[PDB]
PDB file of C-alpha atoms and ligand atoms in Angstrom:
ATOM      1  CA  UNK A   1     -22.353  -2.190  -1.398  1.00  0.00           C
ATOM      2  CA  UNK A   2     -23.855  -5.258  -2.764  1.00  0.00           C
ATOM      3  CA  UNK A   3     -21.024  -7.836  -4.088  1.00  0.00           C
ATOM      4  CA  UNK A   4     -18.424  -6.051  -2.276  1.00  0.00           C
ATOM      5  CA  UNK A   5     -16.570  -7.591   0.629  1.00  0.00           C
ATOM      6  CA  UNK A   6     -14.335  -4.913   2.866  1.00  0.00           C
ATOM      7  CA  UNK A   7     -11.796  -6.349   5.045  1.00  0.00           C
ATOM      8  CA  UNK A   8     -10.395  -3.382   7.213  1.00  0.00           C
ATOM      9  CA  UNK A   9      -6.859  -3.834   8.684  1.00  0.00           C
ATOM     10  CA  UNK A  10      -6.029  -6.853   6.515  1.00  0.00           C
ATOM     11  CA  UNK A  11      -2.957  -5.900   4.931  1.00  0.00           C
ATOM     12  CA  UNK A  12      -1.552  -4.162   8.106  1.00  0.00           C
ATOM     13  CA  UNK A  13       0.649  -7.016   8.677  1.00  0.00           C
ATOM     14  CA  UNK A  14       2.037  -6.835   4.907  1.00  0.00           C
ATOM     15  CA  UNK A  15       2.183  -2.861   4.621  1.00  0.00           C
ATOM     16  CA  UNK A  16       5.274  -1.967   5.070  1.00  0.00           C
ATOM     17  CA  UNK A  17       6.698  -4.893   2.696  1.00  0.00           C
ATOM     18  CA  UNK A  18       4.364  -4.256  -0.004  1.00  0.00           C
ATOM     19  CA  UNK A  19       5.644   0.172   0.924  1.00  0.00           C
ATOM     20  CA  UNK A  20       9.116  -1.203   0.134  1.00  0.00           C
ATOM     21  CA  UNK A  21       8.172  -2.732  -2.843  1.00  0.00           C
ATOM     22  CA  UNK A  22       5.821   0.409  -4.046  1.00  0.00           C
ATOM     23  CA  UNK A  23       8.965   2.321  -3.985  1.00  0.00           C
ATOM     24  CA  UNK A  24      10.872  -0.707  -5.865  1.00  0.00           C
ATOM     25  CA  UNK A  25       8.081  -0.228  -8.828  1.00  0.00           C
ATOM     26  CA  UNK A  26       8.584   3.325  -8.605  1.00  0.00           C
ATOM     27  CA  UNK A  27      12.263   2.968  -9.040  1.00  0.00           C
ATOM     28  CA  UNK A  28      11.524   1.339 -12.490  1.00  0.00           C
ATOM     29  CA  UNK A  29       8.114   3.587 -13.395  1.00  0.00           C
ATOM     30  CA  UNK A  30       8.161   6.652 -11.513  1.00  0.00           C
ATOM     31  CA  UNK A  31       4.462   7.739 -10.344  1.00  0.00           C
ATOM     32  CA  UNK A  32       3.717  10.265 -12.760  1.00  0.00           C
ATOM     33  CA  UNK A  33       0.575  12.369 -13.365  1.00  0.00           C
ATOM     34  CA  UNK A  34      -1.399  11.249 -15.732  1.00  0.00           C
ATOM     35  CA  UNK A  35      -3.048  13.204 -18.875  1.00  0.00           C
ATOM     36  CA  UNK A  36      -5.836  12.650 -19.075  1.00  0.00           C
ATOM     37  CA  UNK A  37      -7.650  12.289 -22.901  1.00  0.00           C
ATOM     38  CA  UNK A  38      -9.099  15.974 -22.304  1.00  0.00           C
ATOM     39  CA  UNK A  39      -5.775  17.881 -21.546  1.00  0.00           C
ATOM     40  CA  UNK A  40      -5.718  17.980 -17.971  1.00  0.00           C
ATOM     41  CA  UNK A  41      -3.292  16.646 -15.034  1.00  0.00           C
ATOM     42  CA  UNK A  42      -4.760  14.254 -12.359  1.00  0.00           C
ATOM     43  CA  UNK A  43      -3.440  15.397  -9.023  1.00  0.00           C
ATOM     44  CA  UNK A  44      -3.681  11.633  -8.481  1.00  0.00           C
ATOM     45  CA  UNK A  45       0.068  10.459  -9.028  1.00  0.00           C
ATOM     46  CA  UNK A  46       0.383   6.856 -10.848  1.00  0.00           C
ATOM     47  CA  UNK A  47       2.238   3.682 -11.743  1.00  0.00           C
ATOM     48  CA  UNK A  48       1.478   0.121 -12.531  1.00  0.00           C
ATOM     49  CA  UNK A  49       3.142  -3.259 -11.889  1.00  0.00           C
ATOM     50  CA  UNK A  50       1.965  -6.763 -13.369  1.00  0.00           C
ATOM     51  CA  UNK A  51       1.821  -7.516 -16.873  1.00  0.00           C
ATOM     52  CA  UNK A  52      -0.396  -4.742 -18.246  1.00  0.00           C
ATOM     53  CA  UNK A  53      -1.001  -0.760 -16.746  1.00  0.00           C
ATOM     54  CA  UNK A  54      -3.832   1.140 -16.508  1.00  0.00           C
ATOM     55  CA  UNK A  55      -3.068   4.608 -18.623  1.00  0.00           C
ATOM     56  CA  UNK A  56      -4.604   7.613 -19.988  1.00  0.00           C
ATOM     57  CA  UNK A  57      -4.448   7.836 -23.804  1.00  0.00           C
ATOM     58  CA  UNK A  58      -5.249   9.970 -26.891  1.00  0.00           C
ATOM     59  CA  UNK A  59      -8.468   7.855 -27.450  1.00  0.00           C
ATOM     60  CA  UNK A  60      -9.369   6.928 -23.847  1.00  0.00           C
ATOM     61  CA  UNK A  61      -8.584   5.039 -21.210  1.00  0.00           C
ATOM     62  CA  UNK A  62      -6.892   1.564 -21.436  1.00  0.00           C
ATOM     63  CA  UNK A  63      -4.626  -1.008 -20.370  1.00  0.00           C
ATOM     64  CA  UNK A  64      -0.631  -1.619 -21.880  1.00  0.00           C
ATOM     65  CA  UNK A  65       1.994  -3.821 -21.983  1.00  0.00           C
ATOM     66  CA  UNK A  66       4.383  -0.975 -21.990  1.00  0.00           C
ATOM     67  CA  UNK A  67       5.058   2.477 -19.659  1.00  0.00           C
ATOM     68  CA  UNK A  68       4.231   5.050 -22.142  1.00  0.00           C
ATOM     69  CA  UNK A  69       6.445   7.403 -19.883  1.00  0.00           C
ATOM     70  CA  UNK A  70       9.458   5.150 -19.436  1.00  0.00           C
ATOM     71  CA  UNK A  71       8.953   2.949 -23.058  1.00  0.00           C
ATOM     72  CA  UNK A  72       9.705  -0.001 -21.369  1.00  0.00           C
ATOM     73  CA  UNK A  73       7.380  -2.706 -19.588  1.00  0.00           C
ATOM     74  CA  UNK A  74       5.737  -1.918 -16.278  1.00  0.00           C
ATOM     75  CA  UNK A  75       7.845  -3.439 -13.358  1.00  0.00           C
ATOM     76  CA  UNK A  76       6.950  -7.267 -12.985  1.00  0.00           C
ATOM     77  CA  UNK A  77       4.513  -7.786  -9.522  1.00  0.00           C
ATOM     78  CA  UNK A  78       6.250  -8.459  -6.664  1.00  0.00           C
ATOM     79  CA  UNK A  79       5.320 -11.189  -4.599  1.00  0.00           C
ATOM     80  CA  UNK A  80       3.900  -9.321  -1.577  1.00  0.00           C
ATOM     81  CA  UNK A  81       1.361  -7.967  -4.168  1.00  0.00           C
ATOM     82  CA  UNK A  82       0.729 -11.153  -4.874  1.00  0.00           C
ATOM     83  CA  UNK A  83       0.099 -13.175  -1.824  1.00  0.00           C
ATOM     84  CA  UNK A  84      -1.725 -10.376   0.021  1.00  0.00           C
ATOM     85  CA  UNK A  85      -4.187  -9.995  -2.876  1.00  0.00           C
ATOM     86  CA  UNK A  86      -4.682 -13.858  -3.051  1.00  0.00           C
ATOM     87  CA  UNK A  87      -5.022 -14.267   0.254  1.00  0.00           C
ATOM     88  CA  UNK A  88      -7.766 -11.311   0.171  1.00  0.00           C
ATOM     89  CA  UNK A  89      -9.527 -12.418  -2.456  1.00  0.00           C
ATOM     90  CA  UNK A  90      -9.705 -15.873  -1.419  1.00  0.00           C
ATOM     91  CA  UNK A  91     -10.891 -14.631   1.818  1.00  0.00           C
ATOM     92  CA  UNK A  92     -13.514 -12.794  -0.263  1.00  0.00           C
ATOM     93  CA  UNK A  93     -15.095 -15.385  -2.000  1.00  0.00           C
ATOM     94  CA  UNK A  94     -12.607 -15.128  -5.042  1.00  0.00           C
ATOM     95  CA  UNK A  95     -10.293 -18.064  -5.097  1.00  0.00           C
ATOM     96  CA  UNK A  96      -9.833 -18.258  -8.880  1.00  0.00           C
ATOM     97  CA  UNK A  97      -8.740 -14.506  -8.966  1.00  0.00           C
ATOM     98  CA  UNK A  98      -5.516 -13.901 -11.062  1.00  0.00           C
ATOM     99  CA  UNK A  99      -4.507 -10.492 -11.406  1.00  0.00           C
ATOM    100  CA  UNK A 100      -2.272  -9.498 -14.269  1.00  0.00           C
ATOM    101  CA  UNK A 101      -2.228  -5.671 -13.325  1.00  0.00           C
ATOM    102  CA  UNK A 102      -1.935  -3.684 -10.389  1.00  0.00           C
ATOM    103  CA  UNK A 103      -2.919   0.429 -10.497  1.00  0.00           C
ATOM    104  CA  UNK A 104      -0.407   2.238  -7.892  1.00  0.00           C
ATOM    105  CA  UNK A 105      -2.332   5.358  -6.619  1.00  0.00           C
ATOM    106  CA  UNK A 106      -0.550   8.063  -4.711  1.00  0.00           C
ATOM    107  CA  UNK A 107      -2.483  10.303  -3.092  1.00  0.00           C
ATOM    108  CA  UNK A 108      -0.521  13.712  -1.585  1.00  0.00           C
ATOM    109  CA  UNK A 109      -2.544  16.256   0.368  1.00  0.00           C
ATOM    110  CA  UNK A 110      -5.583  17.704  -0.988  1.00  0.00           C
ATOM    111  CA  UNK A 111      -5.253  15.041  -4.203  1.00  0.00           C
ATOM    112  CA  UNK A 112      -8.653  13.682  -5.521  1.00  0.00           C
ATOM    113  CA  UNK A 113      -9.913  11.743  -7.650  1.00  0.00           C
ATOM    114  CA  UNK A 114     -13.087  12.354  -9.025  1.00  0.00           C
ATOM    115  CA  UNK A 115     -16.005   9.660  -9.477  1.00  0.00           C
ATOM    116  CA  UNK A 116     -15.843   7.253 -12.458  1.00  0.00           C
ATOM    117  CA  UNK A 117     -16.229   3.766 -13.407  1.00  0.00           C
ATOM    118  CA  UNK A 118     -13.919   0.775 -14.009  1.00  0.00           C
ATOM    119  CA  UNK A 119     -15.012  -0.582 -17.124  1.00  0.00           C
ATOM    120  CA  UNK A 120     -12.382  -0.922 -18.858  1.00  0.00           C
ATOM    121  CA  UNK A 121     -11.693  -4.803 -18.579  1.00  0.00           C
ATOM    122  CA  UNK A 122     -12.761  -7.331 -20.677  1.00  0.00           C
ATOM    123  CA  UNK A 123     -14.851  -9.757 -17.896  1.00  0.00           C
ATOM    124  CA  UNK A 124     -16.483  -7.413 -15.442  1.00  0.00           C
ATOM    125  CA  UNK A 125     -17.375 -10.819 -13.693  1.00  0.00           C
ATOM    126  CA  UNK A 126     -13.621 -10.395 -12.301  1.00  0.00           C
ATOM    127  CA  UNK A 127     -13.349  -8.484  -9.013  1.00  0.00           C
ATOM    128  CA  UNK A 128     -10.965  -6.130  -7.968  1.00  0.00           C
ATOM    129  CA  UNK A 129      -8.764  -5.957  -5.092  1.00  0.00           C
ATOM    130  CA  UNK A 130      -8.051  -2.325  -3.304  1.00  0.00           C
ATOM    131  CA  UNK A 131      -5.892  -1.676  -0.465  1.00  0.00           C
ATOM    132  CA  UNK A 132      -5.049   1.213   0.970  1.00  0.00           C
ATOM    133  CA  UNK A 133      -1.691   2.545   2.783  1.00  0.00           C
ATOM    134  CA  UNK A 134      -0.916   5.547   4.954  1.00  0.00           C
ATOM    135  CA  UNK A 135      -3.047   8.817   5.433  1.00  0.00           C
ATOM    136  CA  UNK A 136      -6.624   7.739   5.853  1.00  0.00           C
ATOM    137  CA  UNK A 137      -9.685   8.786   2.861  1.00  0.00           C
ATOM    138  CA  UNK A 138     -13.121   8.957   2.400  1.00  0.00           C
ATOM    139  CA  UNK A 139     -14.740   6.360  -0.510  1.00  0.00           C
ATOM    140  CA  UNK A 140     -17.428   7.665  -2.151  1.00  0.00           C
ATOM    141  CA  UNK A 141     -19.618   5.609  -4.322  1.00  0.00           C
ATOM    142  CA  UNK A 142     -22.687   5.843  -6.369  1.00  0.00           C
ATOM    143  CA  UNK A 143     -25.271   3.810  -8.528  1.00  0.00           C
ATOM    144  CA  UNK A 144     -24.888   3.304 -12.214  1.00  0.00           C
ATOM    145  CA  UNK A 145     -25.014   6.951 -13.225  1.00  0.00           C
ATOM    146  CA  UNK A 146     -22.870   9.873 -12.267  1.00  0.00           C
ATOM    147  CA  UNK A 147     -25.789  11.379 -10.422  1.00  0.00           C
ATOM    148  CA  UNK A 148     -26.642   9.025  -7.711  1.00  0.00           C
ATOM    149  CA  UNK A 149     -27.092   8.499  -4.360  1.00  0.00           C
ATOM    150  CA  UNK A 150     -23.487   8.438  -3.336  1.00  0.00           C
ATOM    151  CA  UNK A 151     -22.496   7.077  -0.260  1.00  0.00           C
ATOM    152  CA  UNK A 152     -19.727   7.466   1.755  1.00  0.00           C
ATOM    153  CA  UNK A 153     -16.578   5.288   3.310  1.00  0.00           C
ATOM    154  CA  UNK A 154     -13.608   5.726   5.031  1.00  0.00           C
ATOM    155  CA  UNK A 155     -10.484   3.765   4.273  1.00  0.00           C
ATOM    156  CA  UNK A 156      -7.673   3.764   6.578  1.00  0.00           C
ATOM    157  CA  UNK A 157      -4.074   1.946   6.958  1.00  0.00           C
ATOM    158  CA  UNK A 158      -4.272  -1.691   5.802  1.00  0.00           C
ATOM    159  CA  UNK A 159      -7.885  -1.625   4.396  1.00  0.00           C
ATOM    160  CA  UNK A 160      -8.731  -3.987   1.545  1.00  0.00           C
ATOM    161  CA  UNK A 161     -11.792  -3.784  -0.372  1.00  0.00           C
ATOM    162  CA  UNK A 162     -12.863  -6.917  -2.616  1.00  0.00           C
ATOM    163  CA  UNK A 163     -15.328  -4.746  -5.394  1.00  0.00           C
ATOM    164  CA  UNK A 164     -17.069  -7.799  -6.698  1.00  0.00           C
ATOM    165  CA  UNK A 165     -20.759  -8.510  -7.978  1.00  0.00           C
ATOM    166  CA  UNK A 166     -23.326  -5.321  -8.475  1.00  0.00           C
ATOM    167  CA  UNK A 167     -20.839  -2.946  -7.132  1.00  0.00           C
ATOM    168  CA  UNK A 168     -18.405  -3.711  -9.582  1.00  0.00           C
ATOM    169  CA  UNK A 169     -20.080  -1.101 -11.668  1.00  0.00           C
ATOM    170  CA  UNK A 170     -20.746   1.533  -9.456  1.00  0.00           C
ATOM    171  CA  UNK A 171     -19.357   4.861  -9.887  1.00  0.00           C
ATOM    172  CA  UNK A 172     -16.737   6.215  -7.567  1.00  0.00           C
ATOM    173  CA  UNK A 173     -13.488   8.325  -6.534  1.00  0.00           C
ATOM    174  CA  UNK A 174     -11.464   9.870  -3.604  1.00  0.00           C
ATOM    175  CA  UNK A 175     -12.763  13.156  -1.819  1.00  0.00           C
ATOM    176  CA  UNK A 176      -9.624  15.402  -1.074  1.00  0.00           C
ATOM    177  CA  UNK A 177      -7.244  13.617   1.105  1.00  0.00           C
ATOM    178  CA  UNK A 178      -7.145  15.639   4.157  1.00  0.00           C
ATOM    179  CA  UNK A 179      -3.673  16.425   5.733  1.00  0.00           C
ATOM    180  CA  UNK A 180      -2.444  14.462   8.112  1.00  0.00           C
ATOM    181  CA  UNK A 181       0.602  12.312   9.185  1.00  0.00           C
ATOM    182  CA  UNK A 182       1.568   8.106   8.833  1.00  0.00           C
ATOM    183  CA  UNK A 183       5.016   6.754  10.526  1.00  0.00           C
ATOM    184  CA  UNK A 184       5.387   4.698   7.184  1.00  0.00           C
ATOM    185  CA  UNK A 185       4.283   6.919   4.292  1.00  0.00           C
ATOM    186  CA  UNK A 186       4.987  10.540   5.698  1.00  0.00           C
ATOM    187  CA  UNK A 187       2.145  12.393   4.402  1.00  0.00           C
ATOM    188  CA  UNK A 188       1.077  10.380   1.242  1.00  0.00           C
ATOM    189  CA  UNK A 189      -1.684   7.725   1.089  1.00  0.00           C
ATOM    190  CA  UNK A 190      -0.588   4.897  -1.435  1.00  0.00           C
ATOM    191  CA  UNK A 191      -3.928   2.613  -3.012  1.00  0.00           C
ATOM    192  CA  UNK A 192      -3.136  -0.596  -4.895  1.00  0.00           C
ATOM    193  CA  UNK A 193      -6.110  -2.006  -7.061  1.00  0.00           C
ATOM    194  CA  UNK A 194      -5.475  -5.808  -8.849  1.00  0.00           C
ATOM    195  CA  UNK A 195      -7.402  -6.137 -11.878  1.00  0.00           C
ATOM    196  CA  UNK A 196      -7.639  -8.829 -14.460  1.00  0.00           C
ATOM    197  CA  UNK A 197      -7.148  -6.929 -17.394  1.00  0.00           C
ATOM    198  CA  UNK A 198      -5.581  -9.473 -20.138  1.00  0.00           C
TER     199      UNK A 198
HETATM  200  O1  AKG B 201      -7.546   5.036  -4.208  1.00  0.00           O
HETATM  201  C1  AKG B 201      -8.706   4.708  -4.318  1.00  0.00           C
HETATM  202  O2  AKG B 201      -9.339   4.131  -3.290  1.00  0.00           O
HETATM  203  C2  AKG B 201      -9.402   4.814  -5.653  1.00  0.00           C
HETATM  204  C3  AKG B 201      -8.672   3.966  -6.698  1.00  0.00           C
HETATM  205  C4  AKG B 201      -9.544   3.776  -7.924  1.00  0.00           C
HETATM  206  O3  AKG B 201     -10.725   3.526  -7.805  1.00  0.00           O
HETATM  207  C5  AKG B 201      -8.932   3.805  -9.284  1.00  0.00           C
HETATM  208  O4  AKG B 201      -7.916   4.448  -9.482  1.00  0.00           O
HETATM  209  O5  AKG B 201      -9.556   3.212 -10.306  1.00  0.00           O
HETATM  210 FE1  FE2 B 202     -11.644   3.292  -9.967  1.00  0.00          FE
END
């Protein structure tokens, strides 16, 4: 993965904070399953935190101010979110990085997510910052079309992933997230990605 930097275990310290605090976003914006533009529900469950939140609508994909499910603003982003994403990305090579959103992805048994492409921002010169919480789940990623050479990786408890440079345009998604068991999350697998959206 050329550009991307992936530092395994490094929010172990900060994961169950940053678990509270999923469920403190959630109390505001509930994960929900998405719509997406065609008529069909994700079995990926979502929320968002920060100023704007990624979210399916009539005419795409995009990024809002406002939780088209709750009408009000997306939860603000709490601290641990953060420091643990400054202190990854700084880590990474990506000092400068200010994230203004922050895609909660809850992944139950069996959930997916099929491949696709983050294009959606306005400087794709920005990295984004993924961490992943809970049930372990394999990463699959691609070239620059949906029929490439994908290749596989597996992200487990704590895992962050800086997707900067050539990579930030690769294709990708979540195989099935095989059953399984996590003292802090049950049976659910939680992924937060920081984007700089605005
Ligand atoms: O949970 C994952 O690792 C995939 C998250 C992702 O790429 C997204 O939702 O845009
Ligand atoms: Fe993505």
């Amino acid at each position: 993965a050329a550009g991307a930097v992936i530092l395994r275990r490094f929010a172990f310290n900060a994961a169950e904070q940053l678990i509270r605090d999923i469920n403190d976003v959630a109390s505001q914006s509930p994960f929900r399953q998405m719509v997406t533009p065609g008529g069909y529900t994700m079995s990926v469950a979502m929320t968002n935190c920060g100023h704007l939140g990624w979210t399916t609508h009539r005419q795409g994909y995009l990024y809002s101010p406002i939780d088209p499910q709750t009408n009000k603003p997306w939860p603000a982003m709490p601290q641990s979110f953060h420091n643990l994403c400054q202190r990854a990305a700084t880590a990474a090579g990506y000092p400068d990085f200010q994230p203004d959103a922050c895609l909660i992805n809850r992944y139950a048994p069996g959930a997916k997510l099929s491949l696709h492409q983050d294009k959606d921002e306005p400087d794709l010169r920005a990295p984004i910052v993924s961490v992943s919480l809970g049930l372990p789940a394999i990463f699959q990623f691609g070239g620059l079309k949906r029929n490439d050479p994908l290749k596989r990786l597996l992200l487990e408890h704590g895992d962050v992933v800086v997707w900067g440079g050539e990579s930030r345009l690769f294709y990708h998604g979540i195989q099935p997230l095989k059953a399984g068991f996590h003292p802090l999350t049950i049976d659910c697998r939680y992924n937060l990605t920081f984007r700089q959206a605005g």
